[PDB]
Amino acid sequence: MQRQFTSMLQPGVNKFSLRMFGSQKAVEKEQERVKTAGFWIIHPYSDFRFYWDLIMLIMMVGNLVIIPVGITFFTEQTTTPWIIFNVASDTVFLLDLIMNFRTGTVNEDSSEIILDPKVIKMNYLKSWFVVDFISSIPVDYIFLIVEKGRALRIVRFTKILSLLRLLRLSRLIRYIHQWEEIFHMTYDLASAVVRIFNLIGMLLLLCHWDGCLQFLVPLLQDFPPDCWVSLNEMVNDSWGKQYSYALFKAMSHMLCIGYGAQAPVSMSDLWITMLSMIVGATCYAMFVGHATALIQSLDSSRRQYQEKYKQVEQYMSFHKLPADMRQKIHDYYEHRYQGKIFDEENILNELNDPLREEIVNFNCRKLVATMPLFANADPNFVTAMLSKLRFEVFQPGDYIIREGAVGKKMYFIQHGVAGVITKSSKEMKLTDGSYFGEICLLTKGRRTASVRADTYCRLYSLSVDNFNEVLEEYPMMRRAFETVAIDRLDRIGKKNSILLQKFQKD
Amino acid sequence: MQRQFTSMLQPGVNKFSLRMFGSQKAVEKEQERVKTAGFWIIHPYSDFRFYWDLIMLIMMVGNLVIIPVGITFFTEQTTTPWIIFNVASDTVFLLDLIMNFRTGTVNEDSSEIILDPKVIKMNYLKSWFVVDFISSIPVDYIFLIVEKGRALRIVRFTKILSLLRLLRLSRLIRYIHQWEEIFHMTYDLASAVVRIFNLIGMLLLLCHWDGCLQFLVPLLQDFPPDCWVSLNEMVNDSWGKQYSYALFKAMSHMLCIGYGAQAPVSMSDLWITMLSMIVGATCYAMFVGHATALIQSLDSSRRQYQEKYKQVEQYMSFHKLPADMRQKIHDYYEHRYQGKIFDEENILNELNDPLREEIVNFNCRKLVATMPLFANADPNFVTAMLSKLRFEVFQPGDYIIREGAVGKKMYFIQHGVAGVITKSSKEMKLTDGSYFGEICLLTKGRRTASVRADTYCRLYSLSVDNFNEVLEEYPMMRRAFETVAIDRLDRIGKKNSILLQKFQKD
Amino acid sequence: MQRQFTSMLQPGVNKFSLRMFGSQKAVEKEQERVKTAGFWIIHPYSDFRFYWDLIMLIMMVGNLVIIPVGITFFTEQTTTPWIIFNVASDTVFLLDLIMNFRTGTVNEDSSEIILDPKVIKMNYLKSWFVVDFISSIPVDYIFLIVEKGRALRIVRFTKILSLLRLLRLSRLIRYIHQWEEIFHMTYDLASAVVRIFNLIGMLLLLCHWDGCLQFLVPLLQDFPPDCWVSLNEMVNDSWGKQYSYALFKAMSHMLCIGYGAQAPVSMSDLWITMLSMIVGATCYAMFVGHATALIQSLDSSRRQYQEKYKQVEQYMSFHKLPADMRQKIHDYYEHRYQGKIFDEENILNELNDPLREEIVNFNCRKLVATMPLFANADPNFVTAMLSKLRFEVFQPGDYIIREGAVGKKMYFIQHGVAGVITKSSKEMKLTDGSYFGEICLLTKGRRTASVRADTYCRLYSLSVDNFNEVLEEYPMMRRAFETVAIDRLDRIGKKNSILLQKFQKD
Amino acid sequence: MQRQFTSMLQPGVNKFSLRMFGSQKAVEKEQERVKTAGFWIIHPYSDFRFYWDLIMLIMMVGNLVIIPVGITFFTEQTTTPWIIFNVASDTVFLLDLIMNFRTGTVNEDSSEIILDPKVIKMNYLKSWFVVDFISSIPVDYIFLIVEKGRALRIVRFTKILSLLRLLRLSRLIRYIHQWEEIFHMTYDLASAVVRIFNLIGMLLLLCHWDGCLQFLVPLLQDFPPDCWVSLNEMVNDSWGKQYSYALFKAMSHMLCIGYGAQAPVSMSDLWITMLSMIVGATCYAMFVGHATALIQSLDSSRRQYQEKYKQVEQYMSFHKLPADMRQKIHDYYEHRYQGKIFDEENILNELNDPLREEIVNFNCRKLVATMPLFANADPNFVTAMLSKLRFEVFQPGDYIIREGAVGKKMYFIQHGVAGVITKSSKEMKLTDGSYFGEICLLTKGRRTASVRADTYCRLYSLSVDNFNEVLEEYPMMRRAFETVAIDRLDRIGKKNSILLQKFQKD
Ligand SMILES: Nc1ncnc2c1ncn2[C@@H]1O[C@@H]2COP(=O)(O)O[C@H]2[C@H]1O
């Protein structure tokens, strides 16, 4: 029913509307703002405005292609099918002029949309209306009717008047730059791709119009004996032969190849050729510019990784490091970053709490399932530890811990193997999902066995200040870490007295 | 009166003068520095200096266009209108040489302006004066007068001497690069735009001069039978026909199209053509360079947003995240930044206190009007809270708070809806302008109800260390937050005893 | 034995496999995942897959070169050696189609490899299979056999059908982009180098195919009197003469030089020429793009140093600094960075503990050998100091210390000379490997002698908060620093009483 | 005497030597390392090595220009002046081969210079020696002597052999890339400038050699009737006519203009032309690349300021700020940075203590002279305050202080005027060199008068934590600030009792 048509002129509820205004409670307020204004106003983001702009764009490219050819290569632009086509394609561009008095303008000053008739009618007439009117009315047929109540000059002047219809190109530029931002906001296609597909449309269009101009000036001069058409003896050839040749001549100038058969011979030809050369050669330089901007946007991640790693060689060479040590540094960069560039501490800081909580669970589900102390704890404790772990990598043969130092960290093994070493201990191994380094952080003493990486291993580490911050909020968990610690100190025979005293009569 | 003319040579009070010197008390000191020097000195930023440079620029472009044509395509450069024009356009360029002995030089060493006659007269004569003198005096008419007390060689040598007037191009370059910096400091037009509009002027000028040189060498050789003018049989054609052809030949070399009618046939033509090809092809490569520099400056913001967001996909793929979780991360980036790139904590830190105080009020006038605790407080308290809020966004279904955790934050709802959930509570809702999370920060206990986002919502958050820092300076406000808190704990039935005890007999 | 062949289809243990999966325990798990699937599956990183792709690439470039020539410049493509060659080079491209039903696809969604037959057969047939089948079967000989049970049109149509074999270019693009990533991950060649060597292959190939197309259309039209072959009178010349000319014509369009002998004369030639001009001129613009991307990647370090140092002149000119002070600042930047750009505090922070411990030893072995207090200490103390030193540089004549200030630092001399100055002290010198500034940090008092650089010297410095943090963990070392300090205070005669009292009866 | 010649082969003491090694004590050690080696060794940075490389470069460019012409355009390369010139220019390039067995190689591995004869003789013969020998000996005259004990083929083969002398270009490339780094380290000319002046040398040289090749192949074929020389009828013209034409043809291909008179007619010409087109068009694309790299390095500072300020408009538009507030923000950025981009807190942190102390005095000599409390203090106190000041700017009408707030800062007026306002106070003014805000920091109370900017003013500010840190080290200075404070509180009548009590009986 007609109420579904009355709903087509107000703003919609597609994801663009939500991105521009926020929640549905902002969209439904702006939707009433329209309905409570004057008798009809079209919202610039309405489905009606958007389908109208597509109907215009599809028809307007057709008109900017056909009109130059129908003016240039034909006599009798007052015959039946041309009178029908130019009348029909005048009405739609005149309805478009009417609807621009009743469309709400977006403001570059970032306000709410102007959305009122007395503001819109004043804002439009002070801008594009002078070009929009001249390009809409049939000035050539109006002039022909006024002059209707020797004669060959009238056919030349009405040809020159009819070319005012090319000013539609202003609407093609205005409607693309608005319609493009809606698609570019919603569908995320890259800047240089969109800019190139606009510029390829302009190159072909300027080239097509030049390929008409190069024949139109000879025609308005009545084919003088010195011009290219008369020297090539092609005044009476079919229109497709003449057009194919004039377009070849026009794009030969643009791509800088030559000028067709021979160099210009007359004054008109000389000055049309130079204008075409300048417009062509300055337009192809803008294409080389956009091609360069495209190519440099595509390798961004690879380039930034190379530009980062080249800076490490500046440091290694300034300190004059040995060639085997350079290899350990180069190899570590492959195992820690896998050729990808990012800054984890910068990205994780822009996300809110509940995304950061979800990502930091997914990286660690192997520990949470495999390791016994997390597997039965309250989930508000497990998320209090996993949010404070930091990620580290060790190469085979490196010591993570040495005996007789102090403090700072403990480690959980995400992947790989680490060995535990002490006097008279023989040897011992820790696999994936286990943890080490807790004794120094509980007892406040020195370290009691060395630990060494047996394969390329991924560890998560927890610092002494963060470890106490978690356990002070959950004192039931400290007893679990202590009742594991006292058992490990029994196997190694170290039997430390302060922890054994700290457990008694709990 | 004449004192208004004597005031024209000293520095003005337009916004450039204030930007260079600071307050009016610096400008009025420099204005006396001029007046207290020698009998007359012109300040380089004076309105007289600036209108004199415009009179020169407008006339100097006219001379560098007309002089090559009047030398090349004409005999009789001693006829009445040429004697009048070259005399008149000699006097202004000789007055310009006089005023450069009395203009204060700007120093590249960033000092005060040199502004003294014995320093200026020594600094000028050691630099451009040798080129400025040769380009100002009528050397060709002086030579013609000296030789005045078979003959065809004198007309050739006086043509070659008269081309010394093209050295004016040094003044055109010097005066543009100074005059441009005043406009570029005051009106803020972008680097590549200004640099392109300078280079387009040089391309057309070099092309025009080459289009004269290509005919001048044939003329000084008296049109030998092998040269392009004699082979094309155009020795006696009108000057406009000859010039249009010679310019077409010159720009055909620059844009690399061909060489006109046919390839060179003589020694002079061969070496003029190659010089023109090298100057042309190296000059068009600089245009492609500036076109590339322009295009890459225009998409800066879009590009940097793409280059930022591409780096998040490096992180999500390194951690091998699931495809539905990638969608939550992608969607959050659209709701928090709306496709715009900036760093709020870096920009706000460069502004002074009273700008930062004004911006942080404008973002929050909705809270300050709608919420009851700010609406009657002292404005020095309200500005003490709003300056410490941080901005956060939550997606629908995410928990902001869970029961049985601890501390850190409280939240004010700028836009959207949040629901409050607890055992036997049924359900409850908070709308725009309200606040939650205060109970944990006042009581120092654990949380007492969960809170969950019901629509895409914008929150401002306040941390526990900043919350106590404000309330310690305004103890009257803590009573308001507590007398709301005790009422909310009654509705949920939790009735916490420490806060109820803390209120008694105040 | 055949088990070594059955081992060729599973993943290997070369450094790429370790980089993709981690330790050998991840590789050996994926290696069983393959063996435990269906009867045969080829892993995409297998040595069999990689040698098969090389056999295809080497043969496929040969086919995309020979096929256009054998179709264009020859009659009798049913003669003995062509029947042998096209049959043989059909079988290998049909075995390749069979093995793509049994190769595990890599997933762009970063999962484990799909590695199952029912998933692979469904994923392939929904994508490239339609082009892979058409390019593999001998459609021209199949059509010739079907039609085998006036005639000149069949030879033209079988020429047009046989060009379906050029769709192999899709396999050449697919196989390069996978095979390249393995080499680019393992051997680290830069982005723009690899991208240029791909594009040079496409330029020569498009140019070769265009050089066939430019003759093929005349041949399919039976050499009409208006076309370039008939006007140049070369219908009966040897095939090498015709091909050399048609390739010259094709690359003349691509590099924008001309069009061979003369401009086109017929409708076919005009539209083939314009298509060749557009494909050529848009392809050469992509080469200028990649050449620009290469050149800007090579000077990265030099450029960034210039772009950094230019920013210091913005600061020195904003503060209007004197010209001799600018020279001290310029000279300091040469002695501290030696023209190399890096950020030491950012690089050292990405490395793990045991690399950072090794680099910070290598920079200081001169101190550890030459200076007496480190040379006999426990290595866990020496590594506790060297990990907290910071690096500084001083110009000759600058004071490092003044008498009568307080605290902050002490210094170790890596290289150069410093002099010690005090009232009635005469003069005194410290050489490489010595240290100064300890008295203020031990006694908590003020400084007691000035110190001044006598040559461009490199110092390591230690801050007062870090100095106490080390000595609190190793109280035996504080006695060494104190028993040196009390001896130095005796030579200068200052004899400070608090330190002398602090030593008694230890 | 000869000892001054023996000193020419060891390293010097010019600023490059100091930049590479550090102090003179490193240079004088390396200088002995040379003298204590084998009988003679040339150090690569010696004045002898550097003048020898200049003698080679100047002569080698002369040989790579003359040799192609003397081979191509002349018969009788065994005549008197050619035998003299080729013998002489063989000896110097053979002495150069001898001295490369006795020059110390720089190592790309950043070690000390290899500087020993058994290492150098092994390292050279495994690299460039094969090309250095072939390019040094007169192979053509050796072959002519061996063949010396119908004949026209010997003159063709000795022409082809004599072109081996062009391999000298390897020495021209090797010697430039070493000699350039010494100048580029010492004199600081920008990357793209140096790279362009190298590439312009290669363009002219390749173009010159191509202009010889284009005539040499016709000559070795004995001028066949189809080639360009015979069609242009110029077999007997003077050598300058032939060379000028062949160079025009060669650079017409490089700059893509045409191919001279007409398109190629024979097989040799066709394949020489295409090789010249490919070498030319790929070499001009590298010039457009370097021209783009030059132009983008020159506007670096202007561009970065625009790219910074464009990011502020992203922030102002995301918050939808009013248009008058945007103007205050835009205007503040002009008064605080004056269109220059830097980060003061990053630059000042890279300088050592005694530079940072000197710069921070020069910015403040106006305060230190004009203000009474600094003007008589100990210089170790004045440098303890000035090193902790921060710089701020305020627009006219903004409040710096409001009554009834608390703490944080005090201010010193570098330039401009500020007014002091209170109830019943009338009005009061502070000029340049005075200070305000001390009462709140001494008394720990609230503020007691408002302060407002009366002109665009520059302030230095000091924070409460830094203020107490200075005064605790210099308790005599706190009495000065207090004895000013108590006098100011008397003028305003506030008469605060805690400070008045704190002064009694000192
Ligand atoms: N026998 C053991 N079995 C397993 N782990 C042990 C054993 N003995 C010691 N450890 C661990 O080795 C760690 C070495 O560093 P810490 O002494 O701080 O803590 C030690 C324990 O976590």
Side-chain angles (χ1 to χ4, degrees), chain A residues 401-402 409 420-421 428-430 435-437 439 441 446-451 488-489 491:
Chain A
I401 297 300
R402 304 183 192 274
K409 284 181 175 181
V420 183
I421 298 173
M428 178 56 65
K429 298 291 184 68
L430 301 178
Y435 78 103
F436 63 86
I439 307 300
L441 275 63
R446 286 255 158 61
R447 295 277 205 213
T448 67
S450 299
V451 186
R488 285 180 170 183
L489 287 169
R491 300 299 184 180

Side-chain angles (χ1 to χ4, degrees), chain A residues 299 307 333 337 402 404, chain C residues 191 195 296 300 350 357 380:
Chain A
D299 289 345
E307 189 149 68
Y333 262 89
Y337 297 101
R402 304 183 192 274
Chain C
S191 174
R195 291 177 64 87
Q296 289 195 324
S300 170
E350 292 183 26
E357 177 175 299
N380 65 338

Side-chain angles (χ1 to χ4, degrees), chain C residues 29 60 83 95 100 111 135 203 214 292 326 341 435 466:
Chain C
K29 183 176 180 179
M60 182 157 48
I83 290 285
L95 289 175
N100 289 340
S111 70
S135 62
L203 277 155
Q214 302 255 353
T292 307
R326 297 182 178 270
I341 186 160
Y435 78 103
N466 290 350

Side-chain angles (χ1 to χ4, degrees), chain D residues 129 132-146 149 151 154-187 189-221 223-225 227-232 234-236 238-340:
Chain D
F129 174 77
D132 289 351
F133 182 76
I134 288 171
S135 61
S136 301
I137 57 156
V139 178
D140 51 337
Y141 297 147
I142 291 163
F143 180 92
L144 179 63
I145 286 163
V146 170
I154 298 166
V155 181
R156 296 197 295 253
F157 199 74
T158 52
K159 271 167 154 51
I160 294 158
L161 289 173
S162 70
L163 291 163
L164 291 170
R165 289 194 276 284
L166 304 187
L167 291 170
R168 297 183 179 182
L169 179 59
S170 64
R171 277 186 270 194
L172 180 59
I173 290 166
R174 278 151 55 199
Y175 292 179
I176 287 174
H177 281 41
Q178 292 182 354
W179 175 99
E180 177 189 300
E181 285 186 345
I182 299 178
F183 276 24
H184 181 50
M185 173 56 60
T186 49
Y187 307 134
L189 185 61
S191 174
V193 179
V194 181
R195 291 177 64 87
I196 282 176
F197 300 156
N198 294 344
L199 183 64
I200 290 167
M202 289 299 298
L203 277 154
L204 297 173
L205 190 65
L206 291 171
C207 176
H208 177 59
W209 289 0
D210 191 345
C212 301
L213 180 65
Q214 302 255 353
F215 186 94
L216 179 63
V217 184
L219 175 60
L220 296 171
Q221 294 185 316
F223 303 113
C227 77
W228 77 261
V229 183
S230 188
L231 289 176
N232 293 1
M234 69 170 61
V235 174
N236 298 317
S238 61
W239 84 258
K241 174 66 68 67
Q242 300 180 40
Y243 174 70
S244 303
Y245 205 101
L247 179 60
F248 168 64
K249 179 179 286 283
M251 78 166 56
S252 179
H253 303 307
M254 175 182 287
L255 305 181
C256 295
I257 308 282
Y259 349 89
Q262 13 45 17
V265 176
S266 80
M267 289 295 288
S268 61
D269 299 6
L270 295 174
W271 285 103
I272 297 158
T273 295
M274 287 165 51
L275 183 152
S276 179
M277 282 167 47
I278 290 164
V279 172
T282 57
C283 188
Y284 182 79
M286 299 294 165
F287 187 86
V288 174
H290 287 85
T292 307
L294 174 69
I295 289 158
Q296 289 195 324
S297 76
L298 294 180
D299 289 345
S300 170
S301 57
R302 284 297 198 274
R303 174 183 65 247
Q304 287 188 326
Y305 178 71
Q306 290 291 335
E307 189 149 68
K308 182 185 181 70
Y309 186 61
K310 182 55 55 65
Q311 205 174 108
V312 185
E313 190 72 53
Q314 300 294 289
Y315 175 80
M316 295 188 295
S317 65
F318 177 69
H319 292 175
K320 299 186 293 285
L321 302 186
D324 53 352
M325 179 147 58
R326 297 182 178 270
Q327 192 60 227
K328 288 194 73 173
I329 293 166
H330 181 97
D331 175 80
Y332 172 81
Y333 262 89
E334 292 185 1
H335 281 277
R336 185 176 179 83
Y337 297 101
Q338 294 168 230
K340 296 186 175 185

Side-chain angles (χ1 to χ4, degrees), chain A residues 41-74 79 81-83 85-86 88-89 91-107 110-111 113 117 124 128-129 132-146 149 151 154-187 189-213:
Chain A
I41 306 181
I42 296 155
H43 197 74
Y45 312 143
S46 63
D47 293 352
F48 180 68
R49 183 61 179 180
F50 165 98
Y51 295 148
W52 182 256
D53 294 348
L54 282 175
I55 291 161
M56 294 301 294
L57 290 165
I58 290 167
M59 173 183 60
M60 182 157 48
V61 171
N63 277 264
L64 298 186
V65 168
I66 294 164
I67 287 173
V69 181
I71 293 167
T72 303
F73 299 89
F74 293 89
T79 53
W82 289 103
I83 290 285
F85 174 85
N86 192 31
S89 63
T91 68
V92 192
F93 285 83
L94 190 64
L95 289 175
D96 180 68
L97 176 149
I98 288 163
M99 277 163 48
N100 289 340
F101 285 100
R102 294 183 181 277
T103 298
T105 53
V106 178
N107 185 8
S110 69
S111 70
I113 284 158
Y124 182 46
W128 298 117
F129 174 77
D132 289 351
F133 182 76
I134 288 171
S135 61
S136 301
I137 57 156
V139 178
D140 51 337
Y141 297 147
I142 291 163
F143 180 92
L144 179 63
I145 286 163
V146 170
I154 298 166
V155 181
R156 296 197 295 253
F157 199 74
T158 52
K159 271 167 154 51
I160 294 158
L161 289 173
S162 70
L163 291 163
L164 291 170
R165 289 194 276 284
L166 304 187
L167 291 170
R168 297 183 179 182
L169 179 59
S170 64
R171 277 186 270 194
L172 180 59
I173 290 166
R174 278 151 55 199
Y175 292 179
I176 287 174
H177 281 41
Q178 292 182 354
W179 175 99
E180 177 189 300
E181 285 186 345
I182 299 178
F183 276 24
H184 181 50
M185 173 56 60
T186 49
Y187 307 134
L189 185 61
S191 174
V193 179
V194 181
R195 291 177 64 87
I196 282 176
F197 300 156
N198 294 344
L199 183 64
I200 290 167
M202 289 299 298
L203 277 155
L204 297 173
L205 190 65
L206 291 171
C207 176
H208 177 59
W209 289 0
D210 191 345
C212 301
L213 180 65

